[PDB]
From Swiss-Prot, chains A, B, C, D:
Protein name: Ferritin light chain
Family membership noted in the UniProt record: Belongs to the ferritin family.
GO molecular function list: ferric iron binding; ferrous iron binding; iron ion binding
Coiled coil segments of this chain: none
Residue ranges occupied by any Ferritin-like diiron domain in the UniProt entry: 6-155
Superkingdom of source: Eukaryota
GO CC terms, sorted: autolysosome; autophagosome; cytoplasm; cytoplasmic vesicle; ferritin complex
Gene: FTL
Known function: Stores iron in a soluble, non-toxic, readily available form. Important for iron homeostasis. Iron is taken up in the ferrous form and deposited as ferric hydroxides after oxidation. Also plays a role in delivery of iron to cells. Mediates iron uptake in capsule cells of the developing kidney. Delivery to lysosomes by the cargo receptor NCOA4 for autophagic degradation and release or iron.
One Pfam family it belongs to: Ferritin
Length: 173, 173, 173, 173
């Protein structure tokens, strides 16, 4: 039961629970990405740290969604968290491409939810997504696109050297 | 007269003046609530302080609306402020229920005004309501709902003891 | 591939991956427990904080296991994370009982893994489990047992009052 | 003579003296490795510093074993220290491979000694090896494996450039 729920559709409630699952899944993917780059036969510390930090950001995103759900009088419902789509993540560019795909899928889910809340006449929801989700995704996708362009510039000729240098001089900051 | 007014309907201007009256009325209600809990035969200091602080918040809300009205080139028009709906406010749960009803009525008035500004194609207005009104109401209603649940848990068996304890251990922080 | 793996069986490697899944599942359970106690109709902040802190501890446990796996030249393999066993968690004593059951299951999994590593003649593994897992579980289970005894003492007669008081005077520290 | 010796076999005493010789030999190997990379025609300062620091760590390991030997009432017996297996150590990857082989041989000697102390029912000994030897070796071997993977990534195409860059950007920290 709730004594506080007001202007909060069952449709938005359900969509928020689904977005929580997507963010938690994305966090799980980044955890796998991080530990893959910590393998002794991969060994790219700056790449591991980049992905581990994203694991934390996505988890924090899911927690903010859960807090919002309760603030509105909605009810958190958790689902199975699917394992990540790969066990091994290839080279730096492969991993950075997987990350951009992942983030674009989150951004699109946010866009779909804002497009649901506006159809539900729910300004609080739109305000909330705008505030700590929409701009964050845009900034993060730009950074990943910048990274990918640099990796690709580096890995054209001498792939090993380029991967090392990107990790040392871009990611180890 | 105004040399600055732009994209600001007479409809929104009037609605803002009405919202000012509602916030000022809510402030007056909380002032009465606060002094009721200061009566020697009621004597719940943490409950008095809770309501007095809300009197101040609602007044500050009305003042921000008035400042916004002038920023847009609208004109403040003040009306009679109706006395609060009760002279005596019962027990803590009674008062906390009255507060939630009050805040839900403010939130609904904000929702109605955002739903007017969007119909008026007035993004500044929506931005303004989102920024210091919509989220504030949501957070405040959640806190009141949390309080009410705790009071109700406490007041089930031994009502006097429960009221004392809630005031001492939740409100006296 | 690995250039470092030494005295590390495929059996222990697999068992470590399973223990990672169990710790991550336990973290997920505590996340659900934490947000349940944040519901406006439950509203026990100290209980929410207790479970949220355990969510973090179990996640950190899984990450230390993953780091260890890589230090030994083993390979992390992630599985689906099952959703928690309940959607709603009842009263404080119900939740604290579920937590003890959960922690006992983790402890037993650790005992089983130490009993595998000794059968594998793997001292590093035993040392590692002893160091940041076995004693931690014992201390945590004792604290939960202490909590449960206090809740049960409190909730015998007047259940609402007892739950409130335990949250205010034990958990809100 | 000793007035303190208790539960300390002549077998463990002898094994500890042999482990002292192995650690001192490993220290001697690293001293040679360090000074080789200080040659004007080799000149890789970060590689020299890496090996010189390992010379010190292995010596400190032998001294802790000697202190332990006396704490138990055993008697230190020193043997000839064989000169290192090479006079010249090749390139960075060659040297890092020699180091991993060396450390794996130490780790295996520790494992053999823990497997002797357990057969001797000597918990103090196991505790001691676990505490400042087993985990240290594991961490060190992981770091060397990480280094080797990076060197190998670097030295694939342009070996001189890769060796320089690894020394400047990984080892010169
Ligand atoms: Ru919007
Ligand atoms: Ru709007
Ligand atoms: Ru053991
Ligand atoms: Ru042992």
């Amino acid at each position: 039961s709730s004594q506080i729920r007001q202007n909060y559709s069952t449709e938005v409630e359900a969509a928020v629970n689904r977005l929580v699952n997507l963010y938690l899944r994305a966090s799980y993917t980044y955890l796998s990405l991080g530990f893959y780059f910590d393998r002794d036969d991969v060994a790219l510390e700056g790449v591991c740290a980049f992905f581990r930090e994203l694991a934390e950001e996505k988890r924090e995103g899911a927690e903010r969604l859960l807090k919002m759900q309760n603030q509105r009088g909605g009810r958190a419902l958790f689902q199975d968290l699917q394992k990540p789509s790969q066990d091994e993540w290839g080279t730096t560019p492969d991993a950075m491409k997987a990350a951009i795909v992942l983030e674009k899928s989150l951004n699109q889910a946010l866009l779909d939810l804002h497009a649901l809340g506006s159809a539900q006449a729910d300004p609080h929801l739109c305000d909330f997504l705008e505030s700590h989700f929409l701009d964050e995704e845009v900034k993060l996708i730009k950074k990943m696109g910048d990274h990918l362009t640099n990796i690709q510039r580096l890995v054209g000729s001498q792939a090993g050297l380029g991967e090392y240098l990107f990790e040392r001089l871009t990611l180890k900051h």
